[PDB]
Amino acid sequence: DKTFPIMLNGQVNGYACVVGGRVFKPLHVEGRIDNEQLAAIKLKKASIYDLEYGDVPQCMKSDTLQYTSDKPPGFYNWHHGAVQYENNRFTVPRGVGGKGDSGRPILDNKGRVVAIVLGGVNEGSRTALSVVTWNQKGVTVKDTPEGSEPW
Amino acid sequence: DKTFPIMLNGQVNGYACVVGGRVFKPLHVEGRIDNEQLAAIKLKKASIYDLEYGDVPQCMKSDTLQYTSDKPPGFYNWHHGAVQYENNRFTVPRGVGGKGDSGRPILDNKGRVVAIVLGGVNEGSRTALSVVTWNQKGVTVKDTPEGSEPW
Structure with a gap:
């Protein structure tokens, strides 16, 4: 995949993934994009x-x-791990999910983009993420667990 | 197959297809057909x-x-390559999409016509074709991409 990142003061603050139809960039994280062909894209708040x-x-x-x-409960690949659940997110191994590394998509076996992560730093031994998704009929619904923290 | 070129001062500037029931010829082109039995065709605008x-x-x-x-998204026999999508045209590579070859049919695996190209000289890194399609029961639909020059 080729998802260009957000650079803020030398380091990274997020990953602005490119999906066909609408380029995604979370406004929770800050910083400027560094693609000059994408620099002329109009920043519109939503x-x-x-x-x-x-x-x-x-x-x-x-x-x-x-x-x-209508996403299954099957096997999905996270960029540094793996998740297997349908309604909420599955338990992820700890350590991943720090700070300033959100926006990376959660893919499937065919490589299609299924979800865009927003939170999920740490929620105990079992880690569940706050992540936008598609619920049943193309309704783009965000979902956060109890006591969630932005990433 | 059987498709005819349209002569204009000795050069080709279009291709005329024939389907069982009615022949076809694009509006944006002009010239003389290359058949004696197609020389008596009553031309009309639409x-x-x-x-x-x-x-x-x-x-x-x-x-x-x-x-x-109910056309499947699978393989389709384009004359200069292949098209694999249903809702819109698959992104054919560069080089193809010149000029003077309007109206070329896109065939099927069983030698059946499914669409007729109309325009789209160039869109950039890829090339989208404006074709005529039949939507759900056989009603003919003209589909076009954003800013497609006739071709």
Whole structure:
């Protein structure tokens, strides 16, 4: 995958993934993008989903396909781990989920983008993440667990 | 198959397809057909649906069988390559998409016509084709991409 990151004062603060139809960048994290071809994309504020407007040129758009709703309880790959659950997120091994590394998509076996992470730093021995998703009919619904912390 | 070129001062500036029941020829092109039995065709103008008068008799009828709706997203036999999608045209690579080759049919695995190209010289790194499609029961739909120049 080719998801360009957000650089704030030398280090990283988030990952602004590129999905066909709408480029995603969480407004919870800050910093400037460093792609000069994507630097002219208009920064448009949106709702509590922390969404950036998709003014992507069409030929380098839809390079990353996106999984629809009715997602199974099957096996998914996280970029530093693995998760297996349908309604909420499964237990993840600890250590991952620190600070300033959110926005990385949760993929599937076919490589389609299923979900975009927003939180999930630490929630005990079993780690559950606050993550936007598609519920049943294409409704783009965010979901946080109890006592969640932004990432 | 059986598709005809349109002559304009000795050079090719379009391709005319024939389907069982009615012939086809794009509106944006002009010239003379390359057949004596197609020289008596009553030419007429139409809307962007690209409707021509198929007044050919029984002598060369039943040339290309029409493909119905419920088209699968699989392989399709383009003349200069292959197209693999249903909702819109698959991103064909560069090089193809020149000029003067309008109206070329996109065939199937069983030699059945399913769409007729109209435009899209260049979109950038990829190339989207504006074709005519049949939506759900056989109603012909003209589908176009953003800013597609006729071709």
